[PDB]
Coordinates of C-alpha atoms in Angstrom, one line a residue:
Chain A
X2 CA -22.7 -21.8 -0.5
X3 CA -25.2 -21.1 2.1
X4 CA -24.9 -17.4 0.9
X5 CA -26.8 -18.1 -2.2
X6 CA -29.5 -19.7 -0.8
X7 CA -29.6 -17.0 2.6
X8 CA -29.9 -13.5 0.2
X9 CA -32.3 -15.3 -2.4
X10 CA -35.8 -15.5 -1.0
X11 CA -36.8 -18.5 -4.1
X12 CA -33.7 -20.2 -3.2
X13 CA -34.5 -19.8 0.6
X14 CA -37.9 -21.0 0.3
X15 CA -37.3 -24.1 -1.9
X16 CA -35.1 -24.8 0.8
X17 CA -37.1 -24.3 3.3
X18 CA -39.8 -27.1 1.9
X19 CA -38.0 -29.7 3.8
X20 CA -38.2 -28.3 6.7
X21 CA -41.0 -27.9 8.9
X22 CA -42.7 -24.3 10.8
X23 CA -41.5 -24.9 13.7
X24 CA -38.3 -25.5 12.7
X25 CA -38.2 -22.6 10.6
X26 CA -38.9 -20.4 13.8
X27 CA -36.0 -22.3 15.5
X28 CA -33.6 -21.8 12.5
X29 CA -35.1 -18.0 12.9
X30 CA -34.4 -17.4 16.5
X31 CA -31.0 -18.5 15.8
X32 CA -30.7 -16.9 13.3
X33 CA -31.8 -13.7 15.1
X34 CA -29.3 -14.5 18.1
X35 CA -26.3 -14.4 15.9
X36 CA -27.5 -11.3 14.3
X37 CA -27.9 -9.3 17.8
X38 CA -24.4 -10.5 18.9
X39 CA -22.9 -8.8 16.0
X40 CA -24.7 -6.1 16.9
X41 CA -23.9 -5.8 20.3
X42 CA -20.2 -6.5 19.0
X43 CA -19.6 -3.9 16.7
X44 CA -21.0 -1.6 19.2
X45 CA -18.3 -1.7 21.7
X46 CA -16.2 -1.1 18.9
Chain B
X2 CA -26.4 -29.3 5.2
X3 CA -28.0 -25.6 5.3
X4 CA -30.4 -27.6 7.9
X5 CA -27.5 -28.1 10.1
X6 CA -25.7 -24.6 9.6
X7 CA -29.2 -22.8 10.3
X8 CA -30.1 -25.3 13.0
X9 CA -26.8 -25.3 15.4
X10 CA -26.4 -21.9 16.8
X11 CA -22.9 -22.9 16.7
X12 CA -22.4 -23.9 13.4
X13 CA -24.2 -20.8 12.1
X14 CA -22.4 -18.7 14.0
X15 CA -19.2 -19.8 12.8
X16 CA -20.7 -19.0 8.6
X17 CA -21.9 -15.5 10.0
X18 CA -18.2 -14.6 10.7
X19 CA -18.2 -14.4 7.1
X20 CA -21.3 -12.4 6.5
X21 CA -21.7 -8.3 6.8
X22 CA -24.1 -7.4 9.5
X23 CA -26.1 -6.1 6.6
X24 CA -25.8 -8.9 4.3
X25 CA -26.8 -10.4 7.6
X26 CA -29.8 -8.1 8.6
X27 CA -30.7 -8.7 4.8
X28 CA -30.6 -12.6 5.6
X29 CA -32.7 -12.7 8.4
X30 CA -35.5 -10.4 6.8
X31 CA -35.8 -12.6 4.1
X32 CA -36.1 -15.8 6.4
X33 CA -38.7 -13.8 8.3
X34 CA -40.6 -13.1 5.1
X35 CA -40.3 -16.9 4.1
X36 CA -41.5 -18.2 7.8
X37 CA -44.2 -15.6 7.3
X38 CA -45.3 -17.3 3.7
X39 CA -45.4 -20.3 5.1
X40 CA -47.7 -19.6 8.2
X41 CA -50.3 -18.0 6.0
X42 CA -50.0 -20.8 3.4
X43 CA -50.9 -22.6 5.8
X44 CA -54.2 -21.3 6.7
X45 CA -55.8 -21.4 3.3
X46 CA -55.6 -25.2 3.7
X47 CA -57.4 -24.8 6.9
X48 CA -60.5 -22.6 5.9
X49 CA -60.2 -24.0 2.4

């Protein structure tokens, strides 16, 4: 259910209305940290 | 409730196990591009 609103940039930013920049660059960097750890992860495999 | 998924590292870590690293590549350029929106929506109600 998050899915739908993640890989649909209207849904995403309608979304993203209640939330303010700064913690739409936290929800990035997390976002981002996940990302690189299943990088790093299918790597060693 | 997306607030709390995309706000707790752990949380949204957990939903990732879910995601392809592509379908998760793909979701983090489109929250870049939505971050990026909003910055520069936000400085046409400065100079405006």
């Amino acid at each position: 259910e998050i899915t739908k609103t993640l890989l649909n940039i209207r849904s995403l930013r309608a979304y993203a209305r209640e939330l303010t920049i700064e913690q739409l660059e936290e929800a990035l960097d997390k976002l981002t940290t996940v990302v690189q750890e299943r990088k790093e992860a299918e790597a060693e495999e």
